[PDB]
Scaffold this motif. Structure first.
Motif, PDB file in Angstrom:
ATOM      1  N   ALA A   1     -55.393  32.683 144.428  1.00  0.00           N
ATOM      2  CA  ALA A   1     -56.459  33.638 144.136  1.00  0.00           C
ATOM      3  C   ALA A   1     -57.363  33.831 145.349  1.00  0.00           C
ATOM      4  N   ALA A   2     -58.007  34.995 145.438  1.00  0.00           N
ATOM      5  CA  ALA A   2     -58.877  35.310 146.565  1.00  0.00           C
ATOM      6  C   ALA A   2     -60.135  36.008 146.073  1.00  0.00           C
ATOM      7  N   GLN A   3     -61.296  35.472 146.449  1.00  0.00           N
ATOM      8  CA  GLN A   3     -62.587  36.068 146.121  1.00  0.00           C
ATOM      9  C   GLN A   3     -63.196  36.639 147.397  1.00  0.00           C
ATOM     10  N   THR A   4     -63.232  37.966 147.495  1.00  0.00           N
ATOM     11  CA  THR A   4     -63.781  38.622 148.672  1.00  0.00           C
ATOM     12  C   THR A   4     -65.304  38.610 148.636  1.00  0.00           C
ATOM     13  N   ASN A   5     -65.902  38.537 149.825  1.00  0.00           N
ATOM     14  CA  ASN A   5     -67.354  38.463 149.986  1.00  0.00           C
ATOM     15  C   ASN A   5     -67.939  37.302 149.184  1.00  0.00           C
ATOM     16  N   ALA A   6     -67.283  36.151 149.280  1.00  0.00           N
ATOM     17  CA  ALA A   6     -67.791  34.937 148.666  1.00  0.00           C
ATOM     18  C   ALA A   6     -68.953  34.386 149.486  1.00  0.00           C
ATOM     19  N   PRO A   7     -69.803  33.552 148.885  1.00  0.00           N
ATOM     20  CA  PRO A   7     -70.796  32.826 149.685  1.00  0.00           C
ATOM     21  C   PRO A   7     -70.107  32.055 150.802  1.00  0.00           C
ATOM     22  N   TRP A   8     -70.801  31.924 151.938  1.00  0.00           N
ATOM     23  CA  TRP A   8     -70.172  31.307 153.102  1.00  0.00           C
ATOM     24  C   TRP A   8     -69.698  29.891 152.798  1.00  0.00           C
ATOM     25  N   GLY A   9     -70.380  29.193 151.887  1.00  0.00           N
ATOM     26  CA  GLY A   9     -69.981  27.834 151.557  1.00  0.00           C
ATOM     27  C   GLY A   9     -68.644  27.769 150.845  1.00  0.00           C
ATOM     28  N   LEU A  10     -68.390  28.714 149.934  1.00  0.00           N
ATOM     29  CA  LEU A  10     -67.103  28.749 149.246  1.00  0.00           C
ATOM     30  C   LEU A  10     -65.974  29.088 150.210  1.00  0.00           C
ATOM     31  N   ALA A  11     -66.203  30.055 151.100  1.00  0.00           N
ATOM     32  CA  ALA A  11     -65.185  30.415 152.079  1.00  0.00           C
ATOM     33  C   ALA A  11     -64.937  29.286 153.066  1.00  0.00           C
ATOM     34  N   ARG A  12     -65.951  28.461 153.330  1.00  0.00           N
ATOM     35  CA  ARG A  12     -65.777  27.386 154.299  1.00  0.00           C
ATOM     36  C   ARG A  12     -64.857  26.294 153.770  1.00  0.00           C
ATOM     37  N   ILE A  13     -65.042  25.887 152.509  1.00  0.00           N
ATOM     38  CA  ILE A  13     -64.274  24.780 151.942  1.00  0.00           C
ATOM     39  C   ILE A  13     -62.796  25.105 151.781  1.00  0.00           C
ATOM     40  N   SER A  14     -62.410  26.375 151.896  1.00  0.00           N
ATOM     41  CA  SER A  14     -61.008  26.771 151.850  1.00  0.00           C
ATOM     42  C   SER A  14     -60.518  27.294 153.196  1.00  0.00           C
ATOM     43  N   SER A  15     -61.205  26.943 154.281  1.00  0.00           N
ATOM     44  CA  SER A  15     -60.902  27.470 155.603  1.00  0.00           C
ATOM     45  C   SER A  15     -60.788  26.345 156.619  1.00  0.00           C
ATOM     46  N   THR A  16     -59.895  26.543 157.589  1.00  0.00           N
ATOM     47  CA  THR A  16     -59.802  25.660 158.743  1.00  0.00           C
ATOM     48  C   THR A  16     -60.793  26.030 159.837  1.00  0.00           C
ATOM     49  N   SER A  17     -61.426  27.193 159.736  1.00  0.00           N
ATOM     50  CA  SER A  17     -62.385  27.681 160.711  1.00  0.00           C
ATOM     51  C   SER A  17     -63.624  28.203 160.004  1.00  0.00           C
ATOM     52  N   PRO A  18     -64.780  28.143 160.654  1.00  0.00           N
ATOM     53  CA  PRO A  18     -65.970  28.804 160.115  1.00  0.00           C
ATOM     54  C   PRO A  18     -65.913  30.306 160.361  1.00  0.00           C
ATOM     55  N   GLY A  19     -66.885  31.008 159.778  1.00  0.00           N
ATOM     56  CA  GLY A  19     -67.031  32.428 160.029  1.00  0.00           C
ATOM     57  C   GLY A  19     -66.194  33.348 159.170  1.00  0.00           C
ATOM     58  N   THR A  20     -65.675  32.873 158.044  1.00  0.00           N
ATOM     59  CA  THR A  20     -64.915  33.704 157.121  1.00  0.00           C
ATOM     60  C   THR A  20     -65.692  33.875 155.821  1.00  0.00           C
ATOM     61  N   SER A  21     -65.259  34.849 155.013  1.00  0.00           N
ATOM     62  CA  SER A  21     -66.017  35.201 153.819  1.00  0.00           C
ATOM     63  C   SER A  21     -65.141  35.388 152.585  1.00  0.00           C
ATOM     64  N   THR A  22     -63.915  34.873 152.586  1.00  0.00           N
ATOM     65  CA  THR A  22     -63.039  34.965 151.424  1.00  0.00           C
ATOM     66  C   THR A  22     -62.681  33.560 150.960  1.00  0.00           C
ATOM     67  N   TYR A  23     -63.002  33.253 149.706  1.00  0.00           N
ATOM     68  CA  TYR A  23     -62.680  31.966 149.103  1.00  0.00           C
ATOM     69  C   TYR A  23     -61.279  32.034 148.502  1.00  0.00           C
ATOM     70  N   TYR A  24     -60.403  31.131 148.938  1.00  0.00           N
ATOM     71  CA  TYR A  24     -59.048  31.015 148.415  1.00  0.00           C
ATOM     72  C   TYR A  24     -58.921  29.727 147.614  1.00  0.00           C
ATOM     73  N   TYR A  25     -58.262  29.810 146.460  1.00  0.00           N
ATOM     74  CA  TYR A  25     -58.152  28.659 145.573  1.00  0.00           C
ATOM     75  C   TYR A  25     -57.009  28.880 144.594  1.00  0.00           C
TER      76      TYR A  25
END
Length: 279
Positions: A1-25
């Motif tokens: 699943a993908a949540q576009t324009n998620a809070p930066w914290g949600l996008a961070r915990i599903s990312s290997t890099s900072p600076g993204t805005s989509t939460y994947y889970y």
């Protein structure tokens, strides 16, 4: 699943890099788990919770969140937009008054309440406790947290916002539980975040957007904001069957983003919570 324009914290915990805005889970989204929010309460009627949140215990004249802190943390655990585990169940335990303050004996009784009350709940994937609170060192507050972890509840606590060593703070200094520090969107340690050898993991903690009382939202900072990220992640990983309550903090540390944070003092682990999801 993908949540576009998620809070930066949600996008961070599903990312290997900072600076993204989509939460994947994974779409399981913590379904079948339960997270206790031991705080000022939860505004369960907030539409973001979709009827998955409820108050189970209060030590004051009301169970309503007249502060916003507990509602904000629960929103980070499992609200539909601002939550890590968007399908988990949220049980509110009001140990802090509407000023955010509470006696240690009440906080101790709340931890022992969760230790027994989970046997009254349906949580086939496991139970998590999120403790976005803290004060000076207290061996009784620490031991209440160890008892909570020993009963099979993943306890996530805040490291503290003193910019000091969390060894002098409870329940942050209890080694058996998961002590959580705070980082910001540029992968820097939050300027207020506690540190030390007792810290197990870091989570997004600066400018975290979540639910607030009155059916509203707002963005606040604190290790009390990083704790619900880890707790929601634990209920997420437990529903997936990847770990258990006794080994979730260790599993989260094992799969974390390593060495990506800056201004991490010597002796403090450089681990950032990461759900390891591959879409």
């Amino acid at each position: 699943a993908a949540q576009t324009n998620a809070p930066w914290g949600l996008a961070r915990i599903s990312s290997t890099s900072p600076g993204t805005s989509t939460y994947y889970y994974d779409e399981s989204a913590g379904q079948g788990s339960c997270v206790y929010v031991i705080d000022t309460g939860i505004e369960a009627s907030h539409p973001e919770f979709e009827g998955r949140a409820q108050m189970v215990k209060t030590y004051y004249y009301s169970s309503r969140d007249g502060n916003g802190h507990g509602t904000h943390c629960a929103g980070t655990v499992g609200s539909r937009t601002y939550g890590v585990a968007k399908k988990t169940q949220l049980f509110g335990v009001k140990v802090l008054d509407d000023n955010g303050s509470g006696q240690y004996s009440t906080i101790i009784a709340g931890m022992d309440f969760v230790a027994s009350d989970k046997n009254n709940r349906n949580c086939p994937k496991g139970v998590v406790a999120s403790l976005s609170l803290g004060g000076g060192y207290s061996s009784s507050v620490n031991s209440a947290a160890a008892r909570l972890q020993s009963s099979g509840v993943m306890v996530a606590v805040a490291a503290g916002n003193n910019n000091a060593d969390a060894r002098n703070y409870s329940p942050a200094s209890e080694p058996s539980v998961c002590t959580v520090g705070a980082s910001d969107r540029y992968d820097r340690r939050s300027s207020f975040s506690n540190y030390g050898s007792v810290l197990d993991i870091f989570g997004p903690g600066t400018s975290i957007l979540s639910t607030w009382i009155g059916g509203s939202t707002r963005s606040i900072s604190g290790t009390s904001m990083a704790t619900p990220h880890v707790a929601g992640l634990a209920a997420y990983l437990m529903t997936l069957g990847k770990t258990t309550a006794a080994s979730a903090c260790r599993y989260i540390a094992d799969t974390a983003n390593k060495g990506d944070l800056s201004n991490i003092p010597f002796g403090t682990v450089n681990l950032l919570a990461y759900n390891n999801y591959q879409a």
